[PDB]
Scaffold this active site. Structure first.
Site, PDB file in Angstrom:
ATOM      1  N   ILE A 138       0.830  -1.196   0.000  1.00  0.00           N
ATOM      2  CA  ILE A 138       0.000   0.000   0.000  1.00  0.00           C
ATOM      3  C   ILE A 138       0.881   1.270   0.000  1.00  0.00           C
ATOM      4  O   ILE A 138       0.530   2.311  -0.567  1.00  0.00           O
ATOM      5  CB  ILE A 138      -0.929  -0.059   1.255  1.00  0.00           C
ATOM      6  CG1 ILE A 138      -2.002  -1.108   1.032  1.00  0.00           C
ATOM      7  CG2 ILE A 138      -1.568   1.272   1.595  1.00  0.00           C
ATOM      8  CD1 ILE A 138      -2.524  -1.136  -0.388  1.00  0.00           C
ATOM      9  N   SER A 147       4.319   3.379   2.350  1.00  0.00           N
ATOM     10  CA  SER A 147       5.271   3.467   3.444  1.00  0.00           C
ATOM     11  C   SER A 147       4.695   4.112   4.714  1.00  0.00           C
ATOM     12  O   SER A 147       3.738   4.895   4.676  1.00  0.00           O
ATOM     13  CB  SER A 147       6.531   4.199   2.980  1.00  0.00           C
ATOM     14  OG  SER A 147       7.599   4.044   3.904  1.00  0.00           O
ATOM     15  N   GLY A 148       5.294   3.747   5.841  1.00  0.00           N
ATOM     16  CA  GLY A 148       5.022   4.391   7.112  1.00  0.00           C
ATOM     17  C   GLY A 148       6.317   4.894   7.719  1.00  0.00           C
ATOM     18  O   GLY A 148       7.304   5.082   7.011  1.00  0.00           O
ATOM     19  N   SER A 149       6.314   5.100   9.030  1.00  0.00           N
ATOM     20  CA  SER A 149       7.471   5.639   9.717  1.00  0.00           C
ATOM     21  C   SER A 149       8.698   4.722   9.629  1.00  0.00           C
ATOM     22  O   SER A 149       9.705   5.069   8.995  1.00  0.00           O
ATOM     23  CB  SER A 149       7.134   5.919  11.173  1.00  0.00           C
ATOM     24  OG  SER A 149       6.835   4.715  11.852  1.00  0.00           O
ATOM     25  N   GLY A 163       8.943   1.440   8.425  1.00  0.00           N
ATOM     26  CA  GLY A 163       8.563   0.235   7.711  1.00  0.00           C
ATOM     27  C   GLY A 163       7.609   0.419   6.541  1.00  0.00           C
ATOM     28  O   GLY A 163       7.269   1.537   6.146  1.00  0.00           O
ATOM     29  N   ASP A 166       4.011  13.608  14.809  1.00  0.00           N
ATOM     30  CA  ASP A 166       3.922  13.468  13.349  1.00  0.00           C
ATOM     31  C   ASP A 166       2.486  13.562  12.797  1.00  0.00           C
ATOM     32  O   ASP A 166       2.107  12.854  11.865  1.00  0.00           O
ATOM     33  CB  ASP A 166       4.610  12.173  12.917  1.00  0.00           C
ATOM     34  CG  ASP A 166       4.946  12.144  11.435  1.00  0.00           C
ATOM     35  OD1 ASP A 166       5.329  13.196  10.869  1.00  0.00           O
ATOM     36  OD2 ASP A 166       4.829  11.050  10.838  1.00  0.00           O
TER      37      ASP A 166
HETATM   38  O1  29L Z   1      -0.888   7.039   3.984  1.00  0.00           O
HETATM   39  C1  29L Z   1      -0.158   6.243   3.051  1.00  0.00           C
HETATM   40  C2  29L Z   1      -0.893   4.931   2.792  1.00  0.00           C
HETATM   41  N1  29L Z   1      -1.211   4.270   4.064  1.00  0.00           N
HETATM   42  C3  29L Z   1      -0.414   4.095   5.142  1.00  0.00           C
HETATM   43  C4  29L Z   1      -1.128   3.410   6.081  1.00  0.00           C
HETATM   44  C5  29L Z   1      -0.621   3.026   7.400  1.00  0.00           C
HETATM   45  C6  29L Z   1       0.276   3.876   8.032  1.00  0.00           C
HETATM   46  C7  29L Z   1       0.763   3.540   9.266  1.00  0.00           C
HETATM   47  C8  29L Z   1       0.355   2.341   9.868  1.00  0.00           C
HETATM   48  C9  29L Z   1      -0.555   1.492   9.233  1.00  0.00           C
HETATM   49  C10 29L Z   1      -1.033   1.832   7.992  1.00  0.00           C
HETATM   50  C11 29L Z   1      -0.825   0.290  10.097  1.00  0.00           C
HETATM   51  C12 29L Z   1       0.066   0.457  11.334  1.00  0.00           C
HETATM   52  C13 29L Z   1       0.736   1.796  11.174  1.00  0.00           C
HETATM   53  N2  29L Z   1       1.494   2.396  12.020  1.00  0.00           N
HETATM   54  O2  29L Z   1       1.788   1.798  13.265  1.00  0.00           O
HETATM   55  C14 29L Z   1      -2.415   3.146   5.558  1.00  0.00           C
HETATM   56  C15 29L Z   1      -3.594   2.473   6.151  1.00  0.00           C
HETATM   57  C16 29L Z   1      -4.005   2.707   7.467  1.00  0.00           C
HETATM   58  C17 29L Z   1      -5.135   2.072   7.938  1.00  0.00           C
HETATM   59  N3  29L Z   1      -5.852   1.276   7.157  1.00  0.00           N
HETATM   60  C18 29L Z   1      -5.513   1.047   5.903  1.00  0.00           C
HETATM   61  C19 29L Z   1      -4.391   1.634   5.360  1.00  0.00           C
HETATM   62  N4  29L Z   1      -2.441   3.677   4.357  1.00  0.00           N
END
Ligand code: 29L
Ligand code: 29L
Ligand code: CL
Lengths: 257, 257
Positions: free
Chosen positions: A15, A17-19, A21, A128
């Site tokens: 999907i 990137s995150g912080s 990972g 953040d």
């Molecule tokens: O914004 C860019 C795309 N994108 C990033 C995330 C994401 C970002 C951080 C984290 C997680 C998912 C899961 C755990 C986490 N951080 O701990 C998601 C997302 C979040 C929730 N449901 C579906 C997708 N979409």
């Protein structure tokens, strides 16, 4: 305990990137978001960043905080959360140009404030907050996520955080500043400083107080009280900025209109 | 720690009568549901009930499980969950007779099943699954609540539970049976044994094997596989009842049609 035994989690589509990972869509008792660290030799700095995030997440339980479901240490390090169908606020406002009605916008603002309050009351600073980490679940419910840089991006960072003069420039007011940039995104549908093409100049000018967001760019049906609230949350001086209870009270009072 | 400090929880209007307590709408970092012990001093059996319920809830982190936010001991024993904006599934089906499409009915079935599957994989048996502990919320999302009788209302009670003539009369399959009754409600728009007006007799006749839900009363657009699934989930011999992973597989499959 919230460790999930390996073999249970099914990793599917990447999907983004995150912080600390990579984000995948996953299967674990249904759809779940998975942030996973694609790394064979997890350095100790990485473990720590992971330990801390998990540690913080366990302390959260609220509709407006993306629901932590558990973690994995093998085959790789991973955080699991509820899946949110829809997209980030950033995505809505700046990529597919969704046009929300003002009442929906204020509601996004209220919810976003609702979760930030929860966080602070539990002595958690996000560090953040931006429209990318706010997920708009079923296009109704707000979910703040990504607690990697959390403790117990340029446009949303307050001047003191930019300067890095103090030891730790982060505070409850730094998140408040970030949140005010979100209100600006909500009410202008835009990114701040759009007429400047130079990241460095933005960083330098915000840091020195030369630059600030142009509030005259809000929609004509943005309540005057909401521009005021923006400007309180956006004050260049940390101590002049409201905390979330006051922010909440404000938006809730604004709501009857 | 999930102990909410004394004072912060604000209790509003009474909603109805839950399990071993009373349910009010509320306020604690937003709207919440509160189940409180409407008594002054608790009998030590009332007290470990509360303990146990809190012990199950603090092991639940899943979107189809009503979200535990915290517990209080002072003023009184109370449990805080997320507030769900809709109502009980019950309310929609047999009071305001909401006319859901099949797709949505099946979805509710899947979500409910998704939640029940989460529990059982963590060794939790609900023991009070009825359409009244199924709260809809933004009418798309299912939340399974009330873990008063949870461990590790007779219309949803399996016949072996009715008898109480065994070891642990309760089991995963007791839950599966109760889920079968929910499928029935979804597919008929009504309760079973609606043409019988005596509680004692139903108890006697389901206990004896004389009475079972009439499956002719399903919708004409109810798929054969759901009717068939319902009838396996409703089989008097519990060892002939499917478990939830199978139940999920069934529904996800017929949902692809
Ligand atoms: O914004 C860019 C795309 N994108 C990033 C995330 C994401 C970002 C951080 C984290 C997680 C998912 C899961 C755990 C986490 N951080 O701990 C998601 C997302 C979040 C929730 N449901 C579906 C997708 N979409
Ligand atoms: O079905 C009877 C009417 N009714 C009961 C509840 C309820 C039931 C049990 C429990 C809680 C709330 C909270 C704590 C709990 N069990 O631990 C609700 C409700 C649940 C969620 N949001 C809004 C209302 N409606
Ligand atoms: Cl939710």
């Amino acid at each position: 305990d919230w460790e999930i035994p390996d073999g249970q989690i099914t990793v599917g589509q990447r999907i983004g990137s995150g912080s600390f990972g990579t984000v995948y869509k996953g299967k674990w008792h249904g759809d779940v978001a998975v942030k996973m660290l694609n790394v064979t030799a997890p350095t100790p700095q990485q473990l720590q960043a992971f330990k801390n995030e998990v540690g913080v997440l366990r302390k959260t339980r609220h509709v407006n905080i993306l629901l932590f479901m558990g973690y994995s240490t093998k085959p790789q390090l991973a955080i699991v959360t509820q899946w949110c169908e829809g997209s980030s606020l950033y995505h809505h406002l700046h990529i597919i140009e969704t046009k929300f009605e003002m009442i929906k916008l204020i509601d996004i603002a209220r919810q976003t404030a609702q979760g930030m309050d929860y966080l602070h009351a539990k002595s958690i600073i996000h560090r953040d907050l931006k429209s990318n980490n706010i997920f708009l679940h079923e296009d109704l419910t707000v979910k703040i996520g990504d607690f990697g840089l959390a403790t117990e991006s340029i446009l949303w960072m307050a001047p003191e955080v930019i300067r890095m003069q103090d030891k730790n420039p982060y505070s409850f007011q730094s998140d408040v500043y970030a949140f005010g940039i979100v209100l600006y995104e909500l009410m202008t549908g835009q990114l701040p400083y759009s007429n400047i093409n130079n990241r460095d100049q933005i960083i330098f000018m915000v840091g020195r107080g030369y630059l600030s967001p142009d509030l005259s760019k809000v929609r004509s049906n943005c309540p005057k009280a909401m521009k005021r609230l923006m400007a309180e949350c956006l004050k260049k001086k940390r101590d002049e900025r409201p905390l979330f209870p006051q922010i909440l009270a404000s938006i809730e009072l604004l709501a009857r209109s």
